[PDB]
Design a protein around this ligand. Structure first.
Ligand SMILES: CCCCCCCCCCCCCCCCCC(=O)OC[C@H](COP(=O)([O-])OCC(O)COP(=O)([O-])OC[C@@H](COC(=O)CCCCCCCCCCCCCCCCC)OC(=O)CCCCCCCCCCCCCCCCC)OC(=O)CCCCCCCCCCCCCCCCC
Ligand SMILES: COC1=C(OC)C(=O)C(C/C=C(\C)CC/C=C(\C)CC/C=C(\C)CC/C=C(\C)CC/C=C(/C)CC/C=C(\C)CC/C=C(\C)CC/C=C(\C)CC/C=C(\C)CCC=C(C)C)=C(C)C1=O
Ligand SMILES: CCCCCCCCCCCCCCCCCC(=O)OC[C@H](COP(=O)([O-])OCC[N+](C)(C)C)OC(=O)CCCCCCCCCCCCCCCCC
Ligand SMILES: CCCCCCCCCCCCCCCCCC(=O)OC[C@H](COP(=O)([O-])OCC[N+](C)(C)C)OC(=O)CCCCCCCCCCCCCCCCC
Ligand SMILES: CCCCCCCCCCCCCCCCCC(=O)OC[C@H](COP(=O)([O-])OCC[N+](C)(C)C)OC(=O)CCCCCCCCCCCCCCCCC
Ligand SMILES: CCCCCCCCCCCCCCCCCC(=O)OC[C@H](COP(=O)([O-])OCC[N+](C)(C)C)OC(=O)CCCCCCCCCCCCCCCCC
Ligand SMILES: CCCCCCCCCCCCCCCCCC(=O)OC[C@H](COP(=O)([O-])OCC[N+](C)(C)C)OC(=O)CCCCCCCCCCCCCCCCC
Ligand SMILES: CCCCCCCCCCCCCCCCCC(=O)OC[C@H](COP(=O)(O)OCCN)OC(=O)CCCCCCCCCCCCCCCCC
Ligand SMILES: CCCCCCCCCCCCCCCCCC(=O)OC[C@H](COP(=O)(O)OCCN)OC(=O)CCCCCCCCCCCCCCCCC
Ligand SMILES: CCCCCCCCCCCCCCCCCC(=O)OC[C@H](COP(=O)(O)OCCN)OC(=O)CCCCCCCCCCCCCCCCC
Ligand SMILES: CCCCCCCCCC(=O)OC[C@H](COP(=O)(O)OCCC(C)C)OC(=O)CCCCCCC
Ligand SMILES: CCCCCCCCCCCC
Lengths: 96, 315, 51, 66, 117, 8, 174, 174, 100, 168
């Protein structure tokens, strides 16, 4: 009940973001946007944890930095697709 | 919280919105008069008494001309973007340092950066949704412009904040009781004037709405109200960064009429740069705000870090 | 001139903090007396409600 | 040799490097001046602090003039 | 912040009423076939603007994103100077700005701040 | 003001 | 009341975000999602700093992602559906009714605000973002900040290595 | 939480007269108040720090409120109108009631205080320093180190280490 | 807390990341739990520190306090639905805002 | 707290029926749902709402037939003769193999699967009567080698501790 009344919601939204990340979409940039959404909901849950504690919210910027560098890695992978393919279709990539 | 507050905050915010809108109209009149007087010619003189109701002529016509229903556009996204542009350009004005408690913005610099980033979001949404090649080129030029000036605008703000020690702009008033900050920050008086013209999409950085490189920029498919709200959003941004030049570099007092005389003078400076300098290329803008402005901002941030440690030991 | 201005602003801030430090003990005394009264009221009301 | 090329082509970088070196020198001077005296034991203290007479922090309390 | 929400909703409401008043009082003429067409400087377009656009500043955009999250770690230390060890604060601050200067000047040396072309 | 304070 | 309204708006925008094929629909949906998430995060902390920081982060990120929208999948069809509009409207009105008939003391967050802290807390009387952000620049965890500076420099080196600028611009069918 | 085993002071103890002055009336004459109530405030805040229990130092809170009430009676008997003018100037002169906005009425009030009770105004940073006092109550004992007679023990360094019998004793090796 | 596997100088920065020692009401309780986590160990501390673990857990997680509060709130609404509690006297007297 | 929350060996064998059916069909449900969840997405995708449930039933229901036939055959063989032993589990495994042969329309699979499940049944019966456990809790769990206290390599200095081994 206590786990249901508090912080049960961002688990559901993180599950919805995970299902948006793995859904059959035509482009990689939709998966990058779903990554940005699960960064947002991980920020929500980490922010709930760091705000039960009083003065430990300084960590909430470090998670932002590692997540932005994840997004920059994904954006540079999206650039490196154009170096080899002409497209970002997930059907166009090799299945093996 | 006392009930009367909410009422007086609502009244003061609405009065501020109305006065900023009529000052946008008279700012168009001021630009059309002194910008003529930048050259040899005169401003608007015939209509009305001495050209004073000329923005009323410009506002009656644009609120009655036929609304464009473009063919290849996404109209449901094309109709909404100038509304949000005017909404953020008037929503940024709640950050104004009042000596009465209008709003207790402890984080006014972050609020200014958020609305600054959101106004160019409305510009680049309006550029894409028109479905024109010149509109998309103006939108992508606006995105390249904000990617050029955003981190430079932030670090330069931090250097001013260091001289304050807090993010509340009313604390600019206590640190300027003996002199203005134009004495210390003259190289960033030039640099913040350069950034503030890139913020408001004004000459020499006018790539989002180009009249010679492109055809009206991203405003090519906007007419009769969409163009009106886009134009008031741009000029309210001009008024806001003129106000922020008066807050940081000049006296932050608001109970003197000399502050509003200075704000009219900085708006005249904003017109004055447009009437003198030619436009850049946004290649040279990106090579300027990344290799000169950012490096100077980091270096003089180091200078202010060392000066604030030197000052803190003496106190 | 900014160093002199920072001296003046620091003097005003120290005066305001001294006013806060001299006002606070009366406020926290009133806080603890009302806190103990409300704790007694809450303990009586919980005993009344959960009978 | 390379200073004249940098002062001809990128003079704002040279001026910023001079300003940053001056800032590093002033930071060193400020840190040395802060730690030369008892800078950790500041004269005015945030909050309401009371020390007993037998406390070891009691004799470190300054008695300067405002 | 609850008052900022209400006044933001009021500004959005006022701007929608202003745009709807501009639409209502506008002149209502019949829509021509070639009036609605995209402008394209008076001629036929040959291509939609949904055609893919070439990006020559991709590295500058990702460096902008990296530098912006670097901005997100500078903004605390205005407040932290009065409440921390001065030695540790100076080591962190001068080392932060010098590492940013090494990175920016190194990519200036490589020429990666120039547009691809 | 001080008119709130009772006389004693 | 505002917190439950933000709950309902976040739920409705998450249903909208799970159902949008087009990248710009995802971008606008995550715009309003990060607006609502920024306001909700603010409610939990004594100060409003990290909401502002997260808004600068998530407006610096999708500014780049629109350029990749216009460079890759610029031409893709929007498909409005009446079922999604009816579902979102019915769920939104149902959760506003359910939030109106709910006790808001039980549904409020237990995380302490700046005024929920007691008067005796002398650390609450300081400047509002001082003690929260202090440990970034203090002695035990300055080395993590050092690691983050070096990590961002290594990130930039990785981005320069795997986005070769001399191979040319990027587009569809390059 | 509060249970039936924990004692609480009765309602008859907490029903004493309290200071009901406003913020501008407390800020006016705030520097002259602490020169008369230095002993009660320091004792009450010192025993509030270490004891950390609202049931303790209740009589110290009574002494603090009695000293503040006695000072306000002494202000009220002699030149009440000057204090009224100073409190009105401090209320109406600025949003944050700063003493620097009007100093003429502050000078008149300090002149009346010096003419009546021969009290001088302290400096601007008299109450913001560390204050050392001698307290009548004894200090609370420092906690003893926790004892663990059955801990997790290791091999001590002075333990003798003879060579192993039959070597490794693991698969024919010795 | 956890343990460092194959511990190096690189764990000295990581070890002080998130803890309750920085100006928190719970941290002393946490410190006491860490005391037996230094004495008994991580594995004997799961069995011989059941009292010190639970005090820290319902001190910072506030599980039992919030279950108590939600039982106090649900019983009042249950009495209102059953008709024992009148709608005019549904809520008790409010505390002063200067309290707590 | 229901009849679904029951085990196979909560009662002696032959005493209870419905709890054994529910337990063995519960393991059949878990195995069939897991295999069909890694089946219908990965190989031979049905591309429909109804053939997905058809493949779920195809991978689930014969395992229910296996479980029910083995448990009923073991129950009948336990209730027939007085002694409980291994060849009751052997003929239950042969009944489950016959269910496999009825599934796949191949008698040879039905026999070979009957022999394999009978060997599994007699080994499980040896486990339950001899007392040894297939997957026991691990008695010896090395969290390291020798000197796990002595290889603390940290550069920061330890502050003095708040605990002593000395009695007060
Ligand atoms: C456990 C808990 C969690 C459980 C979760 C379960 C639920 C989710 C499962 C999802 C499974 C799945 O994959 O589903 C896909 C499946 C297929 O999706 P689809 O809808 O067919 O395709 C969508 C397109 O692909 C979409 O493609 P697109 O990207 O091209 O579409 C463009 C997109 C573009 O969308 C956008 O750009 C987003 C716009 C959002 C804001 C709009 C504000 C409007 C304000 C006015 O437009 C939309 O998405 C439409 C949005 C319309 C506006 C919605 C307004 C309400 C919400 C407001 C939110 C808050 C914002 C307020 C404003 C804030 C301002 C600062 O989804 C469904 O089937 C939907 C569910 C339908 C259920 C039944 C509904 C009720 C019955 C309807 C019929 C009634 C008939 C009555 C007859 C009576 C007479 C007989
Ligand atoms: C050699 O070869 C060539 C040729 O061959 C020979 C050619 O032929 C040509 C072609 C050239 C030509 C044909 C002619 C040459 C062209 C030029 C000379 C053009 C260059 C000149 C200019 C661009 C003009 C100088 C620029 C100026 C003056 C800047 C300002 C210009 C404007 C248009 C701004 C005016 C717009 C306005 C004011 C918008 C209106 C909106 C408002 C008024 C809104 C404000 C609202 C309010 C004030 C009130 C609202 C209040 C509200 C809503 C709330 C109130 C509520 C209450 C309750 C009170 C070329 C180039 C060539 O090379
Ligand atoms: C700041 C101003 C904000 C806008 C104020 C309203 C619009 C400007 C004033 C009205 C238009 C100009 C005056 C006008 O046309 O007057 C002619 C008309 C009279 O002209 P008439 O149309 O009867 O005759 C033509 C003129 N003769 C006779 C020479 C051929 O004036 C009026 O009707 C008076 C209107 C009110 C004037 C109030 C005083 C204004 C003083 C100057 C303010 C600047
Ligand atoms: C500073 C901001 C100011 C904002 C407002 C600026 C303008 C205010 C003053 C002018 C008001 C004009 C209102 C009508 C605008 C449309 C005119 C038009 O074509 O009408 C044709 C229509 C229809 O007449 P119709 O038969 O000629 O139209 C047939 C269609 N066309 C146009 C193609 C020939 O007329 C009306 O709708 C009459 C409306 C009368 C009342 C108008 C509002 C009065 C209050 C304001
Ligand atoms: C931040 C400021 C944003 C300012 C602009 C807001 C635009 C709101 C549009 C709302 C559309 C709602 C809807 O139903 O859309 C479906 C419609 C479906 O298209 P349609 O043409 O089928 O809809 C017509 C509907 N009838 C027939 C009923 C009239 O799609 C759109 O309107 C297009 C939405 C484009 C969104 C672009 C987002 C850009 C984001 C950039 C940053 C992130 C990258
Ligand atoms: C259809 C497939 C269904 C698979 C179900 C698996 C269930 C399972 O593994 O349960 C755990 C159990 C764990 O068994 P256990 O020995 O731990 O059970 C003791 C349980 N208590 C303590 C409650 C009494 O696994 C088994 O029983 C495995 C038995 C294997 C028997 C066959 C061996 C030979 C195989 C052919 C050669
Ligand atoms: C190369 C790595 C050498 C060190 C590895 C190590 O300490 O391993 C743990 C142990 C010694 O560590 P220990 O003595 O601290 O005990 C293990 C405890 N942990 C792992 C938790 C710290 O070394 C080995 O098991 C040998 C590994 C190397 C393989 C043998 C050939 C050389
Ligand atoms: C909305 C804006 C309302 C105020 C402005 C419009 C009304 C005043 C006005 O300009 O009226 C028109 C007329 C002057 O005609 P105009 O062609 O402007 O003069 C050229 C000579 N300088 O001026 C007149 O006819 C004067 C008489 C009417 C004045 C009305 C003013 C209040 C409306
Ligand atoms: C639990 C342990 C089960 C051990 C089973 C050992 C035998 C085996 O693998 O049988 C699978 C069986 C082989 O059938 P086949 O050889 O094709 O014969 C056709 C004619 N009878 O193939 C079939 O009967 C069909 C497929 C197997 C379905 C029943 C067995 C499921 C076993 C549990 C699966 C758990 C999840 C595995 C996920 C894997 C993901 C990669
Ligand atoms: C002695 C123990 C170890 C024996 C190992 C070798 C025999 C394995 C079992 C086997 O092969 O059984 C035969 C049976 C044949 O089934 P069927 O589908 O008819 O064969 C198709 C031929 N391609 O196969 C089956 O019925 C499949 C049984 C599933 C387990 C297979 C394990 C390998
Ligand atoms: C339609 C919304 C457009 C986007 C607005 C973005 C605002 C800045 C981001 C943010 O989170 O700011 C935190 C700030 C926090 O407030 P501040 O810390 O600025 O001020 C304290 C507040 C009465 C003391 C000054 O909140 C807002 O700006 C309110 C946004 C209202 C949005 C209404 C619609 C949902
Ligand atoms: C580049 C480093 C700048 C800061 C140096 C701080 C230490 C200065 C010397 C202190 C001696 C006690």
């Amino acid at each position: 009940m206590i786990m249901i009344l508090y912080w049960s919601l961002p688990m559901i939204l993180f599950i919805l973001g995970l299902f948006c990340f793995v859904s059959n979409r035509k482009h990689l940039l939709s998966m990058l946007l779903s990554l940005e959404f699960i960064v947002l909901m991980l920020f929500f849950m980490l922010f709930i944890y760091l705000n039960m504690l009083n003065y430990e919210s300084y960590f909430s910027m470090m998670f932002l930095t590692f997540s932005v560098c994840e997004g920059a890695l994904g954006l540079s992978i999206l650039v490196s697709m154009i170096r080899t393919h002409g497209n970002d279709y997930f059907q166009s990539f090799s299945i093996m | 919280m006392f009930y009367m507050e909410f009422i007086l905050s609502l009244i003061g915010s609405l009065l501020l919105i109305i006065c900023v809108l009529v000052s946008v109209a008279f700012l168009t009149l001021l630009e059309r008069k002194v910008l003529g007087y930048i050259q040899i010619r005169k401003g608007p003189n015939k209509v009305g008494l001495m050209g004073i109701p000329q923005p009323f002529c410009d506002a009656i016509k644009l609120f009655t001309k036929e609304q464009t229903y473009p063919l290849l556009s996404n109209y449901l996204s094309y109709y909404i973007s100038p509304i949000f542009s005017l909404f953020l350009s008037l929503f940024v004005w709640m950050c104004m340092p009042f000596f009465v408690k209008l709003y207790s913005f402890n984080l006014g610099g972050l609020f200014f950066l958020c609305c600054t980033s959101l106004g160019v979001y409305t510009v680049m949404v309006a550029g894409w949704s028109s479905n024109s090649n010149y509109a998309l080129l103006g939108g992508l030029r606006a995105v390249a412009q904000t990617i050029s000036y955003e981190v430079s605008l932030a670090l330069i703000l931090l250097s001013f904040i260091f001289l304050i020690g807090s993010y509340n702009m009313i604390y600019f008033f206590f640190y300027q009781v003996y002199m203005w900050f134009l004495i210390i920050l003259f190289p960033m008086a030039l640099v913040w004037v350069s950034i503030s013209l890139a913020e408001t999409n004004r000459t020499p950085f006018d790539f989002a709405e180009g009249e010679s490189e492109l055809v009206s920029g991203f405003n090519v498919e906007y007419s009769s109200g969409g163009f009106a709200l886009i134009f008031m959003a741009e000029y309210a941004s001009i008024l806001f960064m003129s106000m922020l030049f008066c807050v940081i570099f000049l006296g932050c007092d608001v109970f003197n009429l000399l502050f509003y005389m200075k704000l009219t003078f900085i708006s005249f400076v904003f017109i004055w740069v447009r009437g003198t300098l030619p436009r850049f290329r946004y290649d040279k803008l990106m090579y300027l705000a990344w290799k000169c402005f950012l490096s100077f901002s980091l270096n003089y941030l180091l200078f202010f870090i060392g000066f604030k440690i030197l000052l803190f030991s003496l106190l | 001139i900014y160093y002199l201005t920072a001296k003046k602003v620091k003097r005003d801030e120290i005066e305001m903090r001294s006013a806060q430090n001299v006002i606070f003990p009366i406020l926290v005394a009133e806080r603890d007396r009302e806190f103990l009264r409300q704790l007694r009221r809450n303990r009586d009301e919980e005993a009344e409600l959960m009978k | 040799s390379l200073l004249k090329r940098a002062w001809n082509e990128i003079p704002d970088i040279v001026g910023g490097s001079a300003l940053a070196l001056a800032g590093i020198v002033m930071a060193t001077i400020g840190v040395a001046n802060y730690y030369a005296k008892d800078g950790d034991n500041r004269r005015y203290k945030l909050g309401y602090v009371v020390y007993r007479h037998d406390d070891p922090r009691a004799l470190k309390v300054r008695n300067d003039e405002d | 912040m609850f008052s900022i929400i209400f006044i933001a909703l009021l500004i959005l409401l006022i701007t929608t009423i202003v745009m709807f008043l501009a639409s209502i009082l506008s002149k209502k003429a019949l829509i021509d076939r070639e009036k609605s067409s995209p402008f394209e400087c008076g001629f036929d377009p040959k291509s939609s603007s949904r055609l893919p656009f070439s990006l020559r500043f991709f590295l500058i955009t990702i460096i902008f994103l990296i530098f912006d999250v670097e901005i997100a770690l500078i903004l605390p230390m205005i407040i932290i100077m009065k409440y921390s060890n001065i030695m540790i604060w100076t080591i962190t601050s001068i080392i932060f700005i010098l590492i940013l200067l090494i990175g920016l000047y190194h990519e200036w040396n490589q020429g990666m701040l120039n547009w691809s072309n | 003001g001080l008119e709130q304070i009772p006389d004693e | 009341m505002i917190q439950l309204m933000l709950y309902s708006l976040i739920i409705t925008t998450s249903i909208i975000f799970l159902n949008m094929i087009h990248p710009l629909a995802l971008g606008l949906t995550l715009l309003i999602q990060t607006i609502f998430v920024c306001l909700l995060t603010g409610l939990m902390t004594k100060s409003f700093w990290y909401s502002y920081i997260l808004f600068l982060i998530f407006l610096g990120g999708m500014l780049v992602l629109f350029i990749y929208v216009t460079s890759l999948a610029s031409n893709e069809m929007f498909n409005l559906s009446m079922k999604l509009t009816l579902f979102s409207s019915l769920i939104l009105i149902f959760m506003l009714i359910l939030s109106f008939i709910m006790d808001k003391t039980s549904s409020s967050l237990f995380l302490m605000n700046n005024d929920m802290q007691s008067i005796i807390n002398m650390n609450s009387y300081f400047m509002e973002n001082s003690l929260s952000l202090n440990k970034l620049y203090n002695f035990p965890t300055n080395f993590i900040t050092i690691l983050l500076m070096n990590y961002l420099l290594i990130t930039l080196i990785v981005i320069v290595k795997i986005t070769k600028l001399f191979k040319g611009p990027i587009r569809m069918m390059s | 939480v509060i249970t039936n085993n924990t004692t609480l002071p009765e309602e008859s103890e907490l029903n004493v007269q309290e200071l009901n002055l406003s913020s501008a009336a407390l800020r006016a004459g705030a520097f002259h108040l602490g020169k008369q109530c230095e002993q009660a405030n320091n004792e009450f805040m010192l025993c509030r720090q270490e004891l950390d229990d609202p049931r303790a130092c209740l009589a110290e809170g009574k002494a603090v409120t009695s000293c503040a009430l006695d000072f306000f009676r002494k202000v009220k008997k002699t030149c009440h109108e000057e204090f009224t003018q100073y409190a009105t100037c401090l209320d109406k002169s600025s949003g944050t009631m700063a003493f620097s906005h009007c100093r003429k009425t502050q000078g008149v009030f300090d002149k009346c205080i010096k003419d009546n009770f021969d009290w001088d105004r302290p400096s601007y940073g008299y109450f913001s320093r560390a204050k050392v006092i001698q307290s009548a109550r004894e200090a609370p004992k420092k906690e003893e180190k926790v004892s663990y007679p059955d801990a997790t023990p290791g091999l001590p360094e002075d333990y003798p280490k003879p060579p192993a019998k039959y070597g490794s004793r693991f698969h024919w090796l010795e | 807390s956890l343990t460092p596997f194959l511990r190096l100088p690189l764990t000295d920065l990581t070890g002080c990341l998130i803890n309750h020692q920085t100006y928190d009401k719970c941290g002393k309780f946490e410190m006491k739990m860490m005391e037996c986590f230094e004495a008994y160990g991580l594995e004997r501390g799961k069995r011989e520190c059941a009292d010190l673990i639970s005090d820290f857990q319902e001190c910072v997680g506030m599980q039992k306090q919030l279950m108590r509060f939600h039982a106090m709130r649900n019983e009042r609404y249950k009495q209102w639905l059953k008709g024992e509690r009148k709608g005019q006297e549904f809520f008790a007297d409010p505390p002063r805002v200067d309290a707590y | 707290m229901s009849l679904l929350r029951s085990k196979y060996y909560d009662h002696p064998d032959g005493e209870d029926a419905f709890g054994k059916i529910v337990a063995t069909n519960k393991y059949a449900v878990s195995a069939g749902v897991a295999w069909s969840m890694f089946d219908v997405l990965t190989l031979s995708k049905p591309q429909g709402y109804l053939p997905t449930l058809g493949r779920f039933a195809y991978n689930t229901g014969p395992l229910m037939g296996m479980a029910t036939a083995f448990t009923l055959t073991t129950l009948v063989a336990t209730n027939a003769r007085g002694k409980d032993d291994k060849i009751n589990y052997l003929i239950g495994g042969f009944a489950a193999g016959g269910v496999f042969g009825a599934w796949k329309h191949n008698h040879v699979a039905g026999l070979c699967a009957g022999l394999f499940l009978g060997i599994a049944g007699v080994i499980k019966k040896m486990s339950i009567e001899q007392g040894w456990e297939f997957f026991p809790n691990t008695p010896i769990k090395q969290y390291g080698g020798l000197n796990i206290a002595g290889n603390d390599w940290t550069i920061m200095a330890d502050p003095p501790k708040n605990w002593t081994t000395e009695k007060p």
